[PDB]
Ligand binder design. Structure first.
Ligand SMILES: OC[C@H]1O[C@H](O[C@H]2[C@H](O)[C@@H](O)[C@@H](O[C@H]3[C@H](O)[C@@H](O)[C@H](O)O[C@@H]3CO)O[C@@H]2CO)[C@H](O)[C@@H](O)[C@@H]1O
Ligand SMILES: OC[C@H]1O[C@H](O[C@H]2[C@H](O)[C@@H](O)[C@@H](O[C@H]3[C@H](O)[C@@H](O)[C@H](O)O[C@@H]3CO)O[C@@H]2CO)[C@H](O)[C@@H](O)[C@@H]1O
Ligand SMILES: OC[C@H]1O[C@H](O[C@H]2[C@H](O)[C@@H](O)[C@@H](O[C@H]3[C@H](O)[C@@H](O)[C@H](O)O[C@@H]3CO)O[C@@H]2CO)[C@H](O)[C@@H](O)[C@@H]1O
Ligand SMILES: [Ca+2]
Lengths: 421, 421, 421
């Protein structure tokens, strides 16, 4: 049996008191993770090549995830059963080298490690055929599913309904990778079309976006014993909410019962998204490794409830010895509310001493001892409707109750381990 | 460590819209599974032979099961811890070859794969000694437990009680296997006696069945590079509800509080069950394999709330190549309500293209692409008491709200993987 | 992958009726386990030495625990994710042989097997450096965390608060082990300082103990092919509730809302605890093994709600053959309520026939068939406030509703397996 996975766990303190606190800018879809992770997360994968005959084989893979708050020894949880699929390699004679698969699977995910941000992730239940050799590149086709809560109604009279149902969103994915564009440079193109797919008799409330498209272009350049990836993505309507390739076609739906059930008008995700990303990991000589990110993301919703986000960060690693190093991470986030026009910003600086299994910025396991400082100035926040957070924003100053963190700073410190195997 | 288990996962669509839907005749205890399974189910077993000295050994086995709806990537669930037992082989000198065991264990289960129907399954917490060599056959003795919710009350006066408690049901199982009845034919006999076992002070409500018996005779005939199993089973009272060997002695109990607690009259399972089953798997030459089932089951309850069920099905497999085949599954169900006398029927046809690790209808893993068509005509259904389904039936036409699916049809299609290792 | 763990599972019956019942003296923190365990408990550990280079290595370990009531086959549960840590050996050149670690971990726990009682257990999220060689002994430093529910309030005026929060309790642990005091005798000394650590803005209600100390001295003497451990521990205030090294600094807090939130005065754990323990496992010749415990524990609280507990037990094993033996366990508990001055007592006798993987009282797996008899006389119980048990006690006779079991006896019998691997 093959044992693989990922895990992080630690203990931390907040300078002003109590357990460690993690800092993320209101409106930003991520945070600079070094010394800024507040939970024990673990994925335990058990897989096996169950059959092999010649060039043909069947591989079975699983994945059970656990997330606990690391507050005590005994911590109960509901594990997420994320993967359970079978991959058959070389079974289709006329499509030599291709792999056919079916089941729940993390499918060709693309992420930026330092901000733990996935920008191309259509994982979930699915099926497809990958690595079809076109000579000049590899073609991959796949269909996966996601499901939204509610959104499908059996309308009796106009917007009064009898029953609600969860809405299945299908995604059809096509990717062409390995296009040699220049020496040591490769290009991958991808298209995603997603849509809400309602059960017969059910319908989406008035105004649901229904569907959308997403286009991705990623260029990988090998250099400095590492790489640099340049990404450009454009998403449309239903693909703007999740923003990684999964469709949210009934996003914004709601209803109220009095007992006559009324399906409110959908406060939809019609609009578009532009993401220009550039990240990499390179070696600057014998003693230095460097990870970096630079991203501009603009979610332009017709309804004007979107955000414009800028994030930049850098993580240099100095190698004292092959197993010991000092890491520094500096990250900056600036988010502008499309609705109010105000801006929120945060910058965090983390200094960590580390012992890792190898001399790479990518070597894991790693045991860290760190100190983090975060300073933020948030001029807006989402209107906190009691306990639930609204899609609407309000300036911190306007007496409205928002989830804005205000203007402040804090520092934390502690120990942590991270590992993938 | 030994890694074993079972898993199925896939993605599907309903011809008329939305996610895949699965078809089972109202009143039937199973359904024809090919291209008619709607969840990701997986059992991960990790076991080990922990000690061995000569012919003696101790084997430790576990089993953790997961069932998720395959609607998204992240799906939390409460896994069922189903097995955790130790088996000691050859420890009893005077009972050479026998195995003694204790713990939660899937104990000698008998099922029909194509309809995923278990007909002899007393699994659960238990202990026993199996494979005692009698020369002309093997004797096995076991005691397992199951528990019903409520059913035990501390009666103060009449049907008024202070406290309720869950009811333990003990099963005492005896089996004699390996009786050579004819060339290539073997017979196994089994007897099960089960009873609700109340805690001192507690009592079952009026009408509870309390105990029952079940008798099983299974003949296995080796032929056509496969087999044919003929089964005859007769169950009495408490053994008719589950119908596989576990006792439901307080089945039908209920109470209402106003705060004076009243234990209603138990609408018991007194009566009998007859099951005549014939299923098999054989090879018809080089290119054909075939699975088939034929079953008649009659649950005759004193209260007339039972059912008479007929099910027949066939699953031929045509081998294009050693790893690729086309499967067809045709199954028919007919259920007569003992109460109303009405009949429900369904027939489903499934066509699937498959790639499997081997050339047997039993080879797994398997990756399938299928299309299913189901047509049904249901004249009755269980009275849907609001959201909960009642033990009482009503004709579809009688204005009463039942769970009957009426007269209709549907078709689905998708991809799925199934594997046992 | 390294597979390790612990598991127990069985089936039992109570002489007077129904499932097996387990016997523990009201007020006692443990019970004599042989044939007196009523659940299936299992810990499945999957670990791996993920990197090694010379004398340096990184070991990754995990632990997922399950506890089910063994009442049925399918039993859903929320597993506890208890361990996920990395240990790096020999990474600090100037502290040769020491191991640094971070993550959730069972850290150097000390327990008495036969009563399943842990007396030194600060396990949980943490980090530390162990086995620093001092020549005359080994030094270990660690910091772990535990969390209490509520206990931290944002007070607006007096004892009226806006928000509550869970309270983090930090423990700083120092141990010196391996002090050679006499031939075949070794001594370990340990100090624990724990304190509630509140988030800025939050405060503990009035009267909270806030912090405390615990001192441990354990002497191990090797003899009779086994050992004898003599332990003396003294705990103070916040360390008296859990009593194993973890801090409960806001223990006793409560609040009531009317909506004005009032934080009641903390019914604290100020006081002290004395624990004098002596346990061991030795071999008396070829046919006899013996486990024994003797303990006096006195929790003297200022609020007079503590207990004085005496427990003594013996478990001799007679070896019929190398894999078969007869075990007898006799245990006695006597608990005096500090509050009422009344005493509760229980004695249990267990006789078991066992088959184990080896000839030691410590050999596992083991399959047992047993019969247990327990007789108790409880003069007091904790005031059962409806369904919840209070910190206050009352004599059984005083018409007050307590959880006292009265004066009675019972006997059970069954089969069970236990294993650690
Ligand atoms: O294994 C390869 C990748 O491993 C690392 O990715 C980790 C993330 O660091 C970790 O946060 C976690 O991400 C999940 C996230 O926690 C969860 O809330 C979200 O819903 O799904 C995320 C995807 O699982 O797990 C992944 C590994 O699965 C590493 O950061 C990355 O660079 C590697 O490519
Ligand atoms: O492993 C040998 C058997 O494997 C297969 O049986 C599977 C079933 O196909 C699968 O549905 C599942 O059955 C369980 C069912 O899903 C659950 O709801 C019920 O409560 O318990 C059932 C028993 O576990 O798991 C079994 C494997 O345990 C195969 O179909 C069968 O022919 C093989 O003998
Ligand atoms: O593995 C070494 C130890 O194994 C055995 O200890 C078991 C206990 O017997 C078992 O009850 C369980 O204890 C846990 C308890 O059930 C749980 O409720 C509590 O919160 O935590 C306890 C610690 O896990 O698990 C331990 C093993 O972790 C054996 O009894 C002991 O002597 C061995 O040292
Ligand atoms: Ca749960």
């Amino acid at each position: 049996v093959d044992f693989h996975g990922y895990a992080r766990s630690g203990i931390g303190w907040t300078g002003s008191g109590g357990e460690q606190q993690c800092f993320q800018a209101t409106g930003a879809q991520s945070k600079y993770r070094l010394g800024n992770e507040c939970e024990t997360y673990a994925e335990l994968k058990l897989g096996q090549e169950v059959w092999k005959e010649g060039d043909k084989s069947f591989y079975f893979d699983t994945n059970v995830a656990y997330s606990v708050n690391q507050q005590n020894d005994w911590e109960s949880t509901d594990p997420a059963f994320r993967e359970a699929n079978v991959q058959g390699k070389n079974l289709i004679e006329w499509l030599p080298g291709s792999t056919i698969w079916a089941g729940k699977r993390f499918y060709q995910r693309h992420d930026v490690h330092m901000i733990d941000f996935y920008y191309w992730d259509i994982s979930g239940p699915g099926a497809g055929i990958e690595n079809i050799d076109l000579g000049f590149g590899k073609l991959s086709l796949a269909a996966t599913r996601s499901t939204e809560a509610g959104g499908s109604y059996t309308f009796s009279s106009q917007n009064i309904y009898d029953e609600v149902k969860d809405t299945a969103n299908d995604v059809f994915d096509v990717r062409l990778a390995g296009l040699q564009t220049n020496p040591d440079g490769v290009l991958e193109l991808g298209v995603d079309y997603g849509r809400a797919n309602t059960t017969d008799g059910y319908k989406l409330a008035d105004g649901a976006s229904k569907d959308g498209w997403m286009f991705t272009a990623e260029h990988t350049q090998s250099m400095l014993k590492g790489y640099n990836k340049f990404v450009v993505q454009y998403a449309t309507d239903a693909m703007t909410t999740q923003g990684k390739g999964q469709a949210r076609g009934s996003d914004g739906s709601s209803s109220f019962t009095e007992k006559i059930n009324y399906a409110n008008k959908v406060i939809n995700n019609n609009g578009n998204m532009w993401r220009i990303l550039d990240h990499g990991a390179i070696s600057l000589g014998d003693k230095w490794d460097l990870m970096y990110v630079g991203m501009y993301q603009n979610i332009d919703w017709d309804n004007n409830l979107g955000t414009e986000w800028w994030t930049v960060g850098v993580r240099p690693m100095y190698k004292w010895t092959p197993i010991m190093s000092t890491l520094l991470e500096v990250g900056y986030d600036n988010v502008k509310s499309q609705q109010t026009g105000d801006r929120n910003n945060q910058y965090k600086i983390t200094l960590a001493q580390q012992w890792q299994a190898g001399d790479s910025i990518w070597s894991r396991p790693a045991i860290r001892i760190f100190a983090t400082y975060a300073k933020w100035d948030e001029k807006w926040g989402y209107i906190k409707d009691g306990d639930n957070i609204s899609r609407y924003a309000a300036a911190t100053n306007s007496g409205i109750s928002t989830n804005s963190r205000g203007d402040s700073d804090e520092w934390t410190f502690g120990a942590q381990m991270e590992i993938w195997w």
